[PDB]
Design an enzyme around this catalytic site. Sequence first.
Site, PDB file in Angstrom:
ATOM      1  N   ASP A 101       0.842  -1.169   0.000  1.00 19.45           N
ATOM      2  CA  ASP A 101       0.000   0.000   0.000  1.00 19.45           C
ATOM      3  C   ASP A 101       0.912   1.267   0.000  1.00 19.45           C
ATOM      4  OD1 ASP A 101      -1.746   2.090   1.913  1.00 19.45           O
ATOM      5  OD2 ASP A 101      -2.964   1.072   0.350  1.00 19.45           O
ATOM      6  N   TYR A 114      -1.392  11.203   2.130  1.00 19.05           N
ATOM      7  CA  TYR A 114      -2.225  11.459   0.965  1.00 19.05           C
ATOM      8  C   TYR A 114      -2.265  12.933   0.606  1.00 19.05           C
ATOM      9  CZ  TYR A 114      -4.674   6.866   0.926  1.00 19.05           C
ATOM     10  OH  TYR A 114      -5.032   5.556   0.684  1.00 19.05           O
ATOM     11  N   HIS A 120      -7.629  -6.278  -0.180  1.00 19.39           N
ATOM     12  CA  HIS A 120      -6.631  -5.237   0.044  1.00 19.39           C
ATOM     13  C   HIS A 120      -5.631  -5.495   1.216  1.00 19.39           C
ATOM     14  CE1 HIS A 120      -4.622  -1.403   0.111  1.00 19.39           C
ATOM     15  NE2 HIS A 120      -4.829  -1.359   1.417  1.00 19.39           N
TER      16      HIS A 120
HETATM   17  C1  LIG Z   1      -1.535   6.269  -4.044  1.00 19.87           C
HETATM   18  N1  LIG Z   1      -1.862   5.211  -3.095  1.00 19.87           N
HETATM   19  C2  LIG Z   1      -1.005   4.628  -2.224  1.00 19.87           C
HETATM   20  C3  LIG Z   1      -1.763   3.718  -1.521  1.00 19.87           C
HETATM   21  C4  LIG Z   1      -3.077   3.818  -2.018  1.00 19.87           C
HETATM   22  C5  LIG Z   1      -4.285   3.048  -1.599  1.00 19.87           C
HETATM   23  N2  LIG Z   1      -4.569   3.318  -0.185  1.00 19.87           N
HETATM   24  C6  LIG Z   1      -5.670   2.452   0.268  1.00 19.87           C
HETATM   25  C7  LIG Z   1      -5.966   2.578   1.775  1.00 19.87           C
HETATM   26  C8  LIG Z   1      -7.445   2.532   2.115  1.00 19.87           C
HETATM   27  C9  LIG Z   1      -8.100   1.319   2.260  1.00 19.87           C
HETATM   28  C10 LIG Z   1      -9.460   1.220   2.542  1.00 19.87           C
HETATM   29  C11 LIG Z   1     -10.170   2.391   2.730  1.00 19.87           C
HETATM   30  C12 LIG Z   1      -9.536   3.628   2.598  1.00 19.87           C
HETATM   31  C13 LIG Z   1      -8.188   3.687   2.280  1.00 19.87           C
HETATM   32  N3  LIG Z   1      -3.119   4.730  -2.999  1.00 19.87           N
END
Ligand SMILES: Cn1ccc(CNCCc2ccccc2)n1
Lengths: 546, 546
Positions: free
Chosen positions: B334, B465, B523
């Site tokens: 992740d 983020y 995930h």
């Molecule tokens: C650019 N980037 C790096 C990692 C990601 C994905 N993050 C998922 C986390 C999450 C999982 C479930 C709900 C909300 C968030 N995107």
Amino acid sequence: TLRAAVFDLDGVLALPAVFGVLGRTEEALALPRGLLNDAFQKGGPEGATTRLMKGEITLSQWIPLMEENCRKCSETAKVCLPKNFSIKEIFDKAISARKINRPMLQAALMLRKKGFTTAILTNTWLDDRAERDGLAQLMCELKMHFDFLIESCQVGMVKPEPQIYKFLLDTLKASPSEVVFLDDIGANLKPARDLGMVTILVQDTDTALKELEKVTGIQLLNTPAPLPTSCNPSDMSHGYVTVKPRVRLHFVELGSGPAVCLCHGFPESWYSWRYQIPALAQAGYRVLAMDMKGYGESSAPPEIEEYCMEVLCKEMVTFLDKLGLSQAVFIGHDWGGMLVWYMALFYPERVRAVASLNTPFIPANPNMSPLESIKANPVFDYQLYFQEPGVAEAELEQNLSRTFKSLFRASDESVLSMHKVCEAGGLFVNSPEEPSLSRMVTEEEIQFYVQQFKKSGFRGPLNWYRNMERNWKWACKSLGRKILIPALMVTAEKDFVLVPQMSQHMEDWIPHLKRGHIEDCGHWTQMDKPTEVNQILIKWLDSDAR
Amino acid sequence: TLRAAVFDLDGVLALPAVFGVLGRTEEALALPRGLLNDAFQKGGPEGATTRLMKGEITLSQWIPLMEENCRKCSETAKVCLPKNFSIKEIFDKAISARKINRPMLQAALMLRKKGFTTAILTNTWLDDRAERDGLAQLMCELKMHFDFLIESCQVGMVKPEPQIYKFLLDTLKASPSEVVFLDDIGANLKPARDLGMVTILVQDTDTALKELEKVTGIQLLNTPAPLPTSCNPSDMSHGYVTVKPRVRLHFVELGSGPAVCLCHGFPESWYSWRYQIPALAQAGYRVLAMDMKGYGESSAPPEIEEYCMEVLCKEMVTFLDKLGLSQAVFIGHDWGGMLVWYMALFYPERVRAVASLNTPFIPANPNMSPLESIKANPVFDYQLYFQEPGVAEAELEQNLSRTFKSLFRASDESVLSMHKVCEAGGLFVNSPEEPSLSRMVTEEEIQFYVQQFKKSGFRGPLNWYRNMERNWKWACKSLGRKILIPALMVTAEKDFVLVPQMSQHMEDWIPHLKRGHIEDCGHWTQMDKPTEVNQILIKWLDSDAR
Ligand SMILES: Cn1ccc(CNCCc2ccccc2)n1
Ligand SMILES: Cn1ccc(CNCCc2ccccc2)n1
Ligand SMILES: [Mg+2]
Ligand SMILES: [Mg+2]
């Protein structure tokens, strides 16, 4: 006036330089002189090499471009490259041959000691070769000694472009006339000299240090042998392992490779190994420097039997279990030396090799109570003094600065005989209130010990001496065994408590024992003769533990 | 009634047994049947072997006694030992051949899971052989799975002497009729059976487990595939490194061998690797499982730019510098997956190999603002929701149990689409107040995450983020490079945010990329399919990082 010193890596802090391998390779291969340098520099500001140095492409993507350049250069010179001509090969070899230039590093170290801000500014590349680890190690070793490392390929600029010198100045927080800059390429010096920096063109090292010495006013050449690198506690990785419900052990950890567990003496600290920790890690080992039970950030329960050798050793085994280590090399000094011998006798499967500074291995005499044996040697009188819970604690806790300053002294500096300590009424009864500082220690280093000993005082430490009978009974279990794993005994000529001759029979129990001996070295071996200790341990590690 | 189970090592938890090598060696060498066992047992209670088993002498001192015994046995049988007959040799071989008997260990594991107290009671020796590390590793691996390990040579008693069974009972805090004891030697069972213990004579494993199953009433045979070993936080070594004045990183550390740095995702913990940490260490690696910046016991400054990729990565490099590691293998999931790709592109000299679970490597598009790219994919809507400082913090902090229970769910269990999250007003707006527990996690494991997130909440985590633009600009610096170090991409079939097909072009930037793929895996890869993750990482480590 001068406040900052900037060193290049290739040709200045590390030798031989790589361009040197273009020249050398031409000669070795009888190619047209300069052909390899022409290929290397092809295209100038827009050629492959500049894109490398700027971080646009990696070393591995550059190799086949330099190849093409070499081909194109040889075509226009109407020659051939030899069969098996290999740029990868040439560069693997040049980059491995390249070593820290020791007198240049020591100059930088000394200038940094006099308050200079120091930096490395270098045109270098992103190294993704199979053999990149060699450059990573060199860079690691150099960079810890400087305030800043500025790499062309991380900043997107290269010498001699003017912007990188502005970036340097800005990084240094200095004006240009406060800065001396050393480089082996004159073209790379010019923009520094344009801004008014003092510059030194480095050909041979000694002449550059002579100019460096003249311009800074600081002695850099012919200087005495400096001490090994020490540790700064707050730059260390600090580790903590709970070995049982009320007992966590703290340690400092540095290095990779075979695990080496340093066990300090009374009344000391992981920090007593401060000179060994970077040298051993640098020598290819994973160092774990303990606070032994009773000390520093390790737990210190009050009970006497928590500090008998059986319990201390079982805990060291659990410490290895929780860290997932099947073995470690155990190196001990003083009480920590006693402990590692007992690890070797009771847990040889967990001990890769065993070494002791000062402390001899002497089998328990099953025919004499340990207290009697102690009474027979007038120099161990202080150990009787330590028996009665509370008495030595009050004297040793009363003034911690005075305690460590009185204890930690070279052999020609002592202020306390261990002589009829009971009868005198204390260890310090005829020592000064404010001892002078030993040559061995700075006031800062004394204050680290003082601060450590404010957490638990001297009860846990003294308790190590309060299990004579209990340790004797356990040791008697081991009287049929010999120590047959790799083993090193290091004697200290002028340790007057743990004297060399007390070790003289050890070959009866440890027939393949190896030895080192340090002359003019008192009881605090690691800080008294750090250089010699380092050399003796690393040589024995590389031959016996590895 | 039964509350405790006791297992022998040789012939019960580990196979083949060593006595088996006396028998096998006789056969292989055409010696008189039993000659080697006669020598081994010579002298009975007073012979060499008993002194070994009791800790009086070490294995290396025993070898030449067994030698003499073999000689004396052969003389009285009027035969010769073959040229090159070697007891050392025979035993090195038998002890290396001997492996954990997996179904017996799994039985012991299961019984311990149902509340049994478990122990290993074994006649064994002090092993000082050059090759002792192999036994140290076996013992390490077994012993962490039991309440007690009682070794004849540490306690000074041997089966079948009655005193060792009394010592066992006393160690167990149990009466004899509460105990089942398994052994492959009938003579060793008798004193247990005399005290009224249930005993099982182990010949083949399956029959012993059938009897064990019958007598405990617990299913032990034909049981499903158990989960890999997990970590208990308070049994871990905890490490802390200050990488700059307000930033210390915490990590958990297990194992020796090449350094492997695990980087977790949002919003997770070092503990998300709980199933990988013992398996990788056991596979021969030095695991460092981080709390990434923002999380757990690592520092969490409030500022957004403290969490841009450039800063996070430079800090990971400093972390390696302070630990004295020239390289590590970087494995990320992740956000931690994104980070290790950037370590590979900007610091390949420090990365031995790189692997990512779920997160693909996708070069920045220099022609489109990252926010737009994000707006183009409806599944990343939640990322816009995360932009505004404070909004997602309030929802995610409001009820931590509900947060982790809602997030950490297998692919067939979800309670939250990532669907028009902005428009809905939150991530949980149509999820339950009290979600049920996922099959993936226990209530205890949820509460560990909750407790970790009480220290700093979600500001630091969310800040990962909040650097889209800043990360895009830095990434654009790297668009001429390829990743040419060893690299592994692991896709998760049913991760609906980081879908497998998003990785489909990676070979353009990483031409020698290797792959694994886990089907029916959502995930939370490491805790969803821990077994498959383990196998895929260890196979790739052993071939590419080692
Ligand atoms: C650019 N980037 C790096 C990692 C990601 C994905 N993050 C998922 C986390 C999450 C999982 C479930 C709900 C909300 C968030 N995107
Ligand atoms: C049995 N044993 C193990 C270690 C030792 C010597 N400890 C010296 C420490 C000390 C040094 C100076 C003053 C007082 C004490 N004896
Ligand atoms: Mg140069
Ligand atoms: Mg057996």
